[PDB]
Amino acid sequence: RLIFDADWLVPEQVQVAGQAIQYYAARNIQYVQHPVAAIQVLNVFVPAAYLHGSSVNGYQRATAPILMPNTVGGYLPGPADDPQRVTWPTNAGTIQQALKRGYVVVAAGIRGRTTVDKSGQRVGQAPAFIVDMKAAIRYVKYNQGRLPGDTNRIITNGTSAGGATSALAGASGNSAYFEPALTALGAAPATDDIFAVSAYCPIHNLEHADMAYEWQFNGINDWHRYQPVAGTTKNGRPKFEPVSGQLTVEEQALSLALKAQFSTYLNQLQLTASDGTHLTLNEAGMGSFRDVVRQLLISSAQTAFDQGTDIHKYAGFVVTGNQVTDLDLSAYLKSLTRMKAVPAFDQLDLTSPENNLFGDATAKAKHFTALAQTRSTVTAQLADAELIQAINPLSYLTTTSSQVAKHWRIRHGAADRDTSFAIPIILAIMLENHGYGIDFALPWDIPHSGDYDLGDLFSWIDGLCQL
């Protein structure tokens, strides 16, 4: 089975800026033979021209890129998207623009940490999210020819946890680690390596995210964030309430310890400059690597200033003429503010989204770092090291065990405090160090979000496929 039938494609149209976008849709397609959750279906959207042997933006049915966006956030379930969807979470606007650009779009539903089967058993914890993304990719590739588009031009996209999903799909192509799970689900007999990766603020490298967060925010003892509460705003988005707090002495001590250990972690990665020089951090969190973070923020400010943006908002920058000449990084960070407490990801009481992600058939949640396991304030288990490694995109760049996508586009807002800037920077440099194509940027004053630069994203995609 799992044979795509073009007859399932039905005509639809959406108005995009006074202009009508004609396309065809095939929805709620089960992409595995033995699904365990209703969310495991995908939707296919095709520009109308591809049913007429015509072209769009230079692409045809046989050559159109296949964009595979996901709606995963907080490592929660991500329902199959639709260009006509308006309910949160959705990137419907992106699909609309993608169709207009001539891309075929396959939006797959992905299991999340709260997904339970018919009996109430948790079936969406790690590595369910990536197993589903891979199953969806295999479905698409297995159906080359039957499905419009070029299955050799699959480009994943996602934001936050969804960005990590996209990155992981590109990094772990055809990894044997996931074969047992895919076999159980009865996924299509095809490969799952992809062409390119698009990822916005990928919340990945979770087992080292606590150290990175404290390297960045140590010394800033007040945190500020918004927690979802009962009720929803427009289109199903949960209502939020501002919450803040002060780190206890114990948390401040934990923070310093995490920051200190980040130097060791960072140094052992052996990240290098274009000339082979090793980037490092000293015992105080200062050094060549810190310089990179500072410089990236200076570049971010420069780019915005050059485009007419008033960069006098956050403290720390020094401006000479029309040039941003320096930055007091500590001042900027204090101005930006700390969002999460300590640890930011592996909470001692197992209450974070990541703790829940690492739970399994037995435990609702688990720790995923030796530090939090050792200092756990509740009865807890430490997640399997092999599993932690398997869902970290970086693992595939240090050890050969998969076919890695050759093209990457990563973005993380300069005002995004959901994870340290060091996290996406490490990914970007490691990719460059291993010869992969990487387009990276830290967009000025952009919060935790994604799909805010479609003009540039689509330009990058067209450059890879056509240009």
Side-chain angles (χ1 to χ4, degrees), residues 41-115:
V41 294
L42 58 74
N43 298 329
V44 179
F45 305 100
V46 184
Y50 302 163
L51 281 302
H52 287 271
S54 194
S55 63
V56 181
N57 187 47
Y59 298 111
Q60 288 187 297
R61 181 187 188 293
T63 68
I66 298 179
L67 186 72
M68 294 190 77
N70 73 69
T71 58
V72 175
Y75 280 104
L76 291 165
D81 218 344
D82 191 300
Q84 305 187 311
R85 178 182 170 85
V86 300
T87 305
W88 175 84
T90 178
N91 297 295
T94 298
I95 297 179
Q96 289 176 15
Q97 293 302 314
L99 290 170
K100 182 175 181 297
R101 194 79 168 208
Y103 305 161
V104 162
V105 181
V106 176
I110 304 296
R111 283 176 291 166
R113 60 193 174 84
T114 53
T115 299

Coordinates of all heavy atoms in Angstrom, one line a residue, residues 41-115:
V41 N -0.9 11.6 9.6 CA -1.4 11.8 8.3 C -0.7 13.0 7.7 O -0.1 13.8 8.4 CB -3.0 12.0 8.2 CG1 -3.7 10.8 8.8 CG2 -3.3 13.3 9.0
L42 N -0.8 13.1 6.4 CA -0.1 14.2 5.7 C -1.0 14.8 4.6 O -2.0 14.1 4.2 CB 1.2 13.8 5.1 CG 1.4 12.7 4.1 CD1 0.9 13.1 2.7 CD2 2.8 12.2 4.0
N43 N -0.8 16.0 4.3 CA -1.6 16.7 3.3 C -0.6 17.1 2.1 O 0.5 17.5 2.4 CB -2.2 18.0 3.8 CG -3.2 17.7 4.9 OD1 -3.8 16.7 5.0 ND2 -3.3 18.7 5.8
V44 N -1.1 17.0 0.9 CA -0.3 17.3 -0.3 C -1.0 18.5 -1.0 O -2.2 18.5 -1.3 CB -0.2 16.1 -1.2 CG1 0.6 16.5 -2.5 CG2 0.4 15.0 -0.5
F45 N -0.2 19.5 -1.3 CA -0.7 20.7 -2.1 C 0.2 20.9 -3.3 O 1.4 21.0 -3.2 CB -0.7 21.9 -1.2 CG -1.5 21.7 0.1 CD1 -0.8 21.4 1.3 CD2 -2.9 21.7 0.1 CE1 -1.5 21.1 2.5 CE2 -3.6 21.4 1.3 CZ -2.9 21.1 2.4
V46 N -0.5 21.1 -4.4 CA 0.2 21.2 -5.7 C -0.3 22.4 -6.6 O -1.5 22.5 -6.8 CB 0.1 19.9 -6.6 CG1 0.9 20.0 -7.8 CG2 0.5 18.7 -5.7
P47 N 0.7 23.2 -7.1 CA 0.2 24.3 -7.9 C -0.6 23.8 -9.1 O -0.2 22.8 -9.7 CB 1.6 24.9 -8.3 CG 2.4 24.7 -7.1 CD 2.1 23.3 -6.8
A48 N -1.7 24.4 -9.4 CA -2.5 23.9 -10.5 C -1.8 23.7 -11.8 O -2.1 22.8 -12.6 CB -3.7 24.9 -10.7
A49 N -0.8 24.5 -12.1 CA 0.0 24.3 -13.3 C 0.5 22.9 -13.6 O 0.7 22.5 -14.7 CB 1.1 25.4 -13.4
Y50 N 0.9 22.2 -12.5 CA 1.4 20.9 -12.6 C 0.5 19.8 -13.0 O 0.8 18.6 -13.1 CB 2.2 20.6 -11.3 CG 3.3 21.6 -10.9 CD1 3.8 21.7 -9.7 CD2 3.7 22.5 -11.9 CE1 4.7 22.7 -9.4 CE2 4.7 23.5 -11.6 CZ 5.2 23.6 -10.3 OH 6.1 24.6 -10.1
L51 N -0.8 20.2 -13.2 CA -1.8 19.2 -13.6 C -2.2 19.6 -15.0 O -3.1 19.0 -15.6 CB -3.1 19.3 -12.7 CG -3.1 18.6 -11.4 CD1 -2.8 17.2 -11.6 CD2 -2.0 19.3 -10.5
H52 N -1.4 20.6 -15.6 CA -1.6 21.1 -17.0 C -0.3 21.0 -17.8 O -0.3 21.6 -18.9 CB -2.1 22.5 -16.9 CG -3.5 22.6 -16.5 ND1 -4.6 22.6 -17.3 CD2 -4.1 22.8 -15.2 CE1 -5.7 22.7 -16.7 NE2 -5.4 22.8 -15.4
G53 N 0.7 20.3 -17.2 CA 1.9 20.2 -17.9 C 2.6 21.6 -18.1 O 3.3 21.8 -19.1
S54 N 2.3 22.6 -17.2 CA 2.8 23.9 -17.4 C 3.8 24.2 -16.3 O 4.2 23.3 -15.6 CB 1.6 24.9 -17.3 OG 2.1 26.2 -17.7
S55 N 4.2 25.5 -16.2 CA 5.3 25.9 -15.3 C 4.9 27.0 -14.4 O 4.0 27.8 -14.7 CB 6.6 26.2 -16.0 OG 6.4 27.3 -16.9
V56 N 5.6 27.2 -13.3 CA 5.5 28.3 -12.3 C 6.9 28.7 -11.9 O 7.6 27.9 -11.3 CB 4.7 27.8 -11.1 CG1 4.5 29.0 -10.1 CG2 3.3 27.3 -11.5
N57 N 7.2 29.9 -12.0 CA 8.5 30.5 -11.6 C 9.7 29.6 -12.1 O 10.7 29.4 -11.4 CB 8.5 30.5 -10.1 CG 9.8 31.2 -9.5 OD1 10.2 32.2 -10.0 ND2 10.4 30.6 -8.5
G58 N 9.5 29.1 -13.3 CA 10.6 28.3 -13.9 C 10.5 26.8 -13.5 O 11.3 26.0 -14.1
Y59 N 9.6 26.4 -12.7 CA 9.5 25.0 -12.2 C 8.4 24.3 -12.9 O 7.4 24.9 -13.4 CB 9.3 24.9 -10.7 CG 10.4 25.5 -9.9 CD1 10.2 26.6 -9.1 CD2 11.6 24.8 -9.7 CE1 11.2 27.1 -8.2 CE2 12.6 25.3 -8.9 CZ 12.3 26.4 -8.1 OH 13.3 26.9 -7.2
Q60 N 8.5 23.0 -13.0 CA 7.4 22.1 -13.6 C 7.2 21.0 -12.7 O 7.8 20.9 -11.6 CB 7.9 21.6 -15.0 CG 8.0 22.6 -16.1 CD 8.3 22.0 -17.4 OE1 9.4 21.4 -17.6 NE2 7.4 22.1 -18.4
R61 N 6.2 20.2 -13.0 CA 5.8 19.1 -12.1 C 7.0 18.2 -11.8 O 7.2 17.7 -10.7 CB 4.7 18.2 -12.8 CG 4.2 17.0 -12.0 CD 3.3 16.2 -12.9 NE 2.6 15.1 -12.1 CZ 3.2 14.1 -11.6 NH1 4.5 13.9 -11.7 NH2 2.5 13.2 -10.9
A62 N 7.8 17.9 -12.8 CA 9.0 17.0 -12.6 C 10.1 17.6 -11.9 O 11.0 16.9 -11.4 CB 9.5 16.5 -14.0
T63 N 10.2 19.0 -11.8 CA 11.3 19.6 -11.1 C 11.0 20.5 -9.9 O 12.0 21.0 -9.3 CB 12.1 20.5 -12.1 OG1 11.2 21.6 -12.5 CG2 12.4 19.7 -13.4
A64 N 9.8 20.7 -9.6 CA 9.4 21.6 -8.4 C 9.9 21.1 -7.1 O 9.9 19.9 -6.8 CB 7.9 21.7 -8.4
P65 N 10.5 22.0 -6.3 CA 11.0 21.6 -5.0 C 9.8 21.1 -4.1 O 8.7 21.6 -4.4 CB 11.6 22.9 -4.4 CG 11.9 23.7 -5.6 CD 10.8 23.4 -6.6
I66 N 10.0 20.2 -3.2 CA 9.0 19.8 -2.3 C 9.3 20.3 -0.9 O 10.1 19.8 -0.2 CB 8.8 18.2 -2.3 CG1 8.5 17.7 -3.7 CG2 7.8 17.8 -1.3 CD1 8.4 16.2 -3.8
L67 N 8.5 21.3 -0.5 CA 8.7 21.9 0.8 C 8.0 21.1 1.8 O 6.8 20.8 1.6 CB 8.2 23.3 0.8 CG 8.4 24.1 2.1 CD1 9.9 24.5 2.2 CD2 7.6 25.4 2.1
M68 N 8.6 20.7 2.9 CA 8.0 19.9 3.9 C 8.1 20.6 5.3 O 9.0 20.3 6.1 CB 8.6 18.5 4.0 CG 8.3 17.7 2.7 SD 8.8 15.8 2.8 CE 7.3 15.2 3.8
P69 N 7.1 21.5 5.5 CA 7.1 22.2 6.8 C 6.4 21.4 7.9 O 5.6 20.6 7.6 CB 6.3 23.5 6.4 CG 5.2 22.9 5.5 CD 6.0 21.9 4.6
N70 N 6.7 21.7 9.1 CA 6.0 21.1 10.2 C 5.5 22.1 11.2 O 6.0 23.2 11.2 CB 6.9 20.0 10.9 CG 8.0 20.7 11.7 OD1 7.7 21.3 12.8 ND2 9.3 20.6 11.3
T71 N 4.5 21.8 12.0 CA 3.9 22.7 12.9 C 4.3 22.4 14.4 O 3.6 22.8 15.3 CB 2.4 22.7 12.8 OG1 1.9 21.4 13.0 CG2 2.0 23.1 11.4
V72 N 5.4 21.7 14.5 CA 5.9 21.3 15.9 C 6.4 22.5 16.6 O 7.3 23.2 16.1 CB 6.9 20.2 15.8 CG1 7.5 19.9 17.2 CG2 6.3 18.9 15.3
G73 N 6.0 22.6 17.9 CA 6.4 23.6 18.8 C 6.4 23.0 20.2 O 5.6 22.2 20.5
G74 N 7.4 23.4 21.0 CA 7.5 22.9 22.3 C 7.6 21.3 22.4 O 7.3 20.8 23.5
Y75 N 8.0 20.7 21.3 CA 8.1 19.3 21.2 C 6.7 18.6 21.4 O 6.6 17.4 21.8 CB 9.1 18.7 22.2 CG 10.5 18.9 21.6 CD1 11.4 19.8 22.1 CD2 11.0 18.0 20.6 CE1 12.7 20.0 21.6 CE2 12.2 18.2 20.0 CZ 13.1 19.2 20.5 OH 14.3 19.4 20.0
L76 N 5.7 19.4 21.1 CA 4.3 18.9 21.2 C 3.9 18.4 19.9 O 4.6 18.6 18.9 CB 3.4 20.1 21.6 CG 3.6 20.6 23.1 CD1 2.9 22.0 23.2 CD2 3.0 19.6 24.1
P77 N 2.7 17.8 19.8 CA 2.2 17.3 18.5 C 2.1 18.5 17.5 O 1.7 19.6 17.9 CB 0.9 16.7 18.8 CG 1.0 16.3 20.2 CD 1.7 17.4 20.8
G78 N 2.4 18.2 16.2 CA 2.3 19.2 15.2 C 1.3 18.7 14.1 O 1.7 17.9 13.3
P79 N 0.1 19.2 14.1 CA -0.9 18.7 13.1 C -0.5 19.1 11.6 O 0.2 20.0 11.4 CB -2.2 19.4 13.5 CG -1.7 20.7 14.2 CD -0.5 20.2 15.0
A80 N -1.0 18.3 10.7 CA -0.8 18.5 9.3 C -1.3 19.9 8.9 O -2.5 20.2 9.2 CB -1.5 17.4 8.4
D81 N -0.5 20.7 8.3 CA -0.8 22.1 7.9 C -1.7 22.1 6.7 O -1.8 21.2 5.9 CB 0.4 22.9 7.8 CG 0.2 24.3 8.3 OD1 -1.0 24.7 8.6 OD2 1.2 25.0 8.6
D82 N -2.2 23.3 6.4 CA -3.0 23.5 5.2 C -3.0 25.0 4.9 O -3.0 25.9 5.8 CB -4.5 23.1 5.6 CG -5.4 23.1 4.4 OD1 -5.6 24.1 3.7 OD2 -6.0 22.0 4.1
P83 N -2.9 25.4 3.6 CA -2.9 26.8 3.2 C -4.1 27.6 3.7 O -4.2 28.8 3.7 CB -2.7 26.8 1.7 CG -3.3 25.5 1.3 CD -2.9 24.5 2.4
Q84 N -5.2 26.8 4.0 CA -6.5 27.4 4.4 C -6.7 27.3 5.9 O -7.7 27.7 6.4 CB -7.6 26.8 3.7 CG -7.5 26.8 2.1 CD -8.8 26.3 1.4 OE1 -9.3 25.2 1.8 NE2 -9.2 27.1 0.4
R85 N -5.7 26.8 6.6 CA -5.7 26.6 8.1 C -5.5 28.0 8.7 O -4.7 28.8 8.2 CB -4.7 25.6 8.5 CG -4.6 25.4 10.1 CD -3.5 24.4 10.4 NE -3.3 24.3 11.9 CZ -4.0 23.6 12.7 NH1 -5.0 22.8 12.3 NH2 -3.7 23.6 14.0
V86 N -6.2 28.3 9.8 CA -6.0 29.5 10.5 C -5.8 29.3 12.0 O -5.4 30.2 12.7 CB -7.3 30.5 10.3 CG1 -7.5 30.8 8.9 CG2 -8.5 29.8 10.9
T87 N -6.1 28.1 12.4 CA -5.9 27.7 13.8 C -4.5 27.4 14.2 O -3.8 26.7 13.6 CB -6.8 26.5 14.2 OG1 -8.1 26.7 13.8 CG2 -6.7 26.2 15.7
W88 N -4.1 28.0 15.4 CA -2.7 27.8 15.9 C -2.6 26.4 16.3 O -3.5 25.8 16.9 CB -2.5 28.8 17.1 CG -1.2 28.6 17.8 CD1 0.0 29.1 17.5 CD2 -1.0 27.7 19.0 NE1 0.9 28.7 18.4 CE2 0.4 27.8 19.3 CE3 -1.8 26.9 19.8 CZ2 0.9 27.2 20.4 CZ3 -1.2 26.2 20.8 CH2 0.1 26.4 21.1
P89 N -1.4 25.8 16.0 CA -0.3 26.3 15.3 C -0.4 26.1 13.8 O -0.9 25.0 13.4 CB 0.9 25.5 15.9 CG 0.3 24.2 16.0 CD -1.1 24.4 16.6
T90 N 0.0 27.1 13.0 CA -0.1 27.0 11.6 C 0.9 27.9 10.9 O 1.2 29.0 11.4 CB -1.5 27.3 11.1 OG1 -1.5 27.2 9.6 CG2 -2.0 28.7 11.5
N91 N 1.3 27.5 9.7 CA 2.2 28.3 8.9 C 1.6 28.4 7.5 O 2.2 28.4 6.5 CB 3.6 27.7 8.8 CG 4.3 27.6 10.1 OD1 4.7 28.6 10.7 ND2 4.6 26.3 10.5
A92 N 0.2 28.5 7.6 CA -0.6 28.5 6.3 C -0.1 29.6 5.3 O -0.1 29.3 4.1 CB -2.1 28.8 6.7
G93 N 0.2 30.7 5.8 CA 0.7 31.8 5.0 C 1.9 31.4 4.2 O 2.1 31.8 3.0
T94 N 2.8 30.7 4.8 CA 4.0 30.2 4.1 C 3.7 29.2 3.0 O 4.2 29.3 1.9 CB 5.0 29.5 5.1 OG1 5.4 30.5 6.1 CG2 6.2 29.0 4.4
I95 N 2.7 28.3 3.3 CA 2.3 27.4 2.3 C 1.7 28.1 1.1 O 1.9 27.8 -0.1 CB 1.3 26.4 2.8 CG1 1.9 25.5 3.9 CG2 0.8 25.4 1.7 CD1 1.0 24.5 4.6
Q96 N 0.9 29.2 1.4 CA 0.2 30.0 0.3 C 1.3 30.5 -0.6 O 1.2 30.4 -1.8 CB -0.6 31.1 1.0 CG -1.9 30.6 1.7 CD -2.6 31.7 2.3 OE1 -2.3 32.9 2.1 NE2 -3.6 31.4 3.2
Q97 N 2.3 31.2 0.0 CA 3.4 31.8 -0.7 C 4.2 30.8 -1.5 O 4.7 31.0 -2.6 CB 4.3 32.6 0.2 CG 3.6 33.9 0.8 CD 3.1 34.8 -0.3 OE1 3.8 35.1 -1.2 NE2 1.8 35.3 -0.1
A98 N 4.4 29.6 -0.9 CA 5.2 28.5 -1.5 C 4.5 28.0 -2.8 O 5.2 27.8 -3.8 CB 5.3 27.4 -0.5
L99 N 3.2 27.9 -2.7 CA 2.4 27.4 -3.9 C 2.6 28.5 -5.0 O 2.7 28.1 -6.2 CB 1.0 27.2 -3.5 CG 0.7 26.0 -2.6 CD1 -0.7 26.1 -2.1 CD2 1.0 24.8 -3.4
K100 N 2.5 29.7 -4.6 CA 2.6 30.9 -5.6 C 4.0 30.9 -6.2 O 4.1 31.2 -7.4 CB 2.3 32.2 -4.8 CG 2.4 33.4 -5.7 CD 2.0 34.7 -4.9 CE 2.0 35.9 -5.7 NZ 3.4 36.2 -6.3
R101 N 5.0 30.4 -5.4 CA 6.3 30.3 -5.9 C 6.6 29.1 -6.7 O 7.7 29.0 -7.3 CB 7.3 30.3 -4.7 CG 8.7 30.6 -5.0 CD 9.0 32.1 -5.2 NE 10.4 32.4 -5.2 CZ 10.9 33.6 -4.8 NH1 10.1 34.6 -4.4 NH2 12.2 33.8 -4.9
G102 N 5.7 28.2 -6.8 CA 5.8 27.0 -7.6 C 6.3 25.8 -6.9 O 6.7 24.8 -7.5
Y103 N 6.3 25.8 -5.6 CA 6.7 24.7 -4.8 C 5.6 23.7 -4.5 O 4.4 24.2 -4.3 CB 7.3 25.1 -3.4 CG 8.4 26.1 -3.5 CD1 8.7 26.9 -2.3 CD2 9.2 26.3 -4.6 CE1 9.7 27.8 -2.4 CE2 10.2 27.3 -4.6 CZ 10.5 28.0 -3.5 OH 11.5 28.9 -3.5
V104 N 5.9 22.4 -4.5 CA 4.9 21.5 -4.1 C 5.0 21.4 -2.6 O 6.2 21.6 -2.1 CB 5.2 20.1 -4.7 CG1 4.4 19.0 -3.9 CG2 4.8 20.0 -6.2
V105 N 4.0 21.3 -1.8 CA 4.1 21.3 -0.4 C 3.4 20.0 0.2 O 2.3 19.7 0.0 CB 3.4 22.5 0.3 CG1 3.5 22.5 1.8 CG2 4.0 23.8 -0.3
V106 N 4.2 19.3 1.0 CA 3.7 18.1 1.7 C 3.9 18.5 3.2 O 5.0 18.6 3.7 CB 4.5 16.9 1.4 CG1 4.0 15.7 2.2 CG2 4.4 16.6 -0.1
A107 N 2.7 18.7 3.9 CA 2.7 19.0 5.3 C 2.2 17.8 6.1 O 1.0 17.4 6.0 CB 1.7 20.2 5.5
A108 N 3.1 17.2 6.8 CA 2.8 16.0 7.6 C 2.5 16.3 9.1 O 3.1 17.2 9.7 CB 4.0 15.0 7.5
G109 N 1.6 15.6 9.6 CA 1.3 15.7 11.0 C 2.3 14.9 11.8 O 2.7 13.8 11.3
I110 N 2.8 15.4 12.9 CA 3.9 14.8 13.7 C 3.5 14.6 15.1 O 3.0 15.5 15.8 CB 5.1 15.7 13.6 CG1 5.5 15.9 12.2 CG2 6.3 15.0 14.4 CD1 5.9 14.7 11.4
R111 N 3.7 13.4 15.6 CA 3.4 13.1 17.0 C 4.3 13.9 18.0 O 5.4 14.3 17.6 CB 3.7 11.6 17.3 CG 2.7 10.6 16.8 CD 3.1 9.2 17.1 NE 4.3 8.9 16.3 CZ 5.1 7.8 16.5 NH1 4.9 7.0 17.5 NH2 6.0 7.5 15.6
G112 N 3.7 14.2 19.1 CA 4.4 15.0 20.1 C 4.4 14.4 21.5 O 3.7 13.4 21.7
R113 N 5.1 15.0 22.5 CA 5.1 14.4 23.8 C 3.8 14.2 24.6 O 3.8 13.4 25.5 CB 6.0 15.4 24.7 CG 5.5 16.8 24.8 CD 6.6 17.7 25.4 NE 6.3 19.1 25.5 CZ 5.6 19.7 26.4 NH1 5.1 18.9 27.5 NH2 5.3 21.0 26.4
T114 N 2.8 14.8 24.1 CA 1.5 14.6 24.8 C 0.6 13.6 24.0 O -0.5 13.3 24.5 CB 0.7 15.9 24.9 OG1 0.6 16.6 23.6 CG2 1.4 16.9 25.9
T115 N 1.0 13.1 22.9 CA 0.3 12.2 22.1 C 0.1 10.9 22.8 O 1.1 10.2 23.2 CB 1.0 11.9 20.7 OG1 1.0 13.2 20.0 CG2 0.1 10.9 19.9

